[PDB]
């Protein structure tokens, strides 16, 4: 109820304002070779931030399922070995 909302609120937070802020700013500064730094250095920042969090928020969204399945998987194999 609150895990998914926090996951959706934060991914939309960067994607709607912060990621475009780095994207829109970089669209102008390309003549000055040093001004290419700040905004694409900023672009690589939030763009990867959304990259690993979606690999981290989904990680806790799968590890609470995969391990739950694995804990389930641990049950019948324990129900096998005890039965053995």
């Amino acid at each position: 109820t609150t895990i998914d909302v926090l996951s959706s609120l934060f991914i939309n937070l960067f994607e709607n304002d912060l990621i475009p802020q780095a994207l829109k700013d970089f669209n102008k500064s390309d003549d000055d070779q040093f001004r290419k730094l700040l905004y694409k250095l900023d672009l690589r920042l939030f763009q990867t931030i959304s990259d690993q969090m979606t690999r981290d928020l989904k990680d806790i969204l799968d590890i609470n399922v995969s391990n739950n399945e694995l804990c389930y998987q641990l049950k019948q194999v324990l129900a096998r070995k005890e039965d053995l």
């Binding site: 109820t1 609150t2 895990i3 909302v5 926090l6 609120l9 934060f10 939309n12 937070l13 709607n16 304002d17 912060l18 070779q33 040093f34 290419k36 730094l37 700040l38 250095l41 900023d42 690589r44 920042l45 990867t48 931030i49 690993q52 969090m53 981290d56 928020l57 990680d59 806790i60 590890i63 995969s66 391990n67 694995l70 804990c71 998987q73 641990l74 194999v77 324990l78 070995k81």
Partner: protein, 114 residues
Amino acid sequence: PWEFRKVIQAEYRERKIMIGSILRLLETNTVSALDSVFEKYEKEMNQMTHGDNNEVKRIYSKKERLLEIILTKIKKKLRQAKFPSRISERDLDIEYIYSKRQFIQNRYSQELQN
């Protein structure tokens, strides 16, 4: 986007350290990212910083200062937002649960050969 509560109040009707706990989870995520991919992109610094360490410091200060002004903005936007305390900063950390997965998958392995 911004204005959490207007969305959040419209959300939580169809279903502060805790708020700070969520807040410091952003800090861990936004600072490790501020570092981890910085060296992955650091090999491009020399060719476009014109061999100037001051320009390297200039971007670091600007890439930082542009974050706390939002970090203060996100702090003031998160306090006004409300959440139920069903989240732990330990659980959201990948390493704590990845190690727990390692223990669980290993425990699944010793009994497998048993």
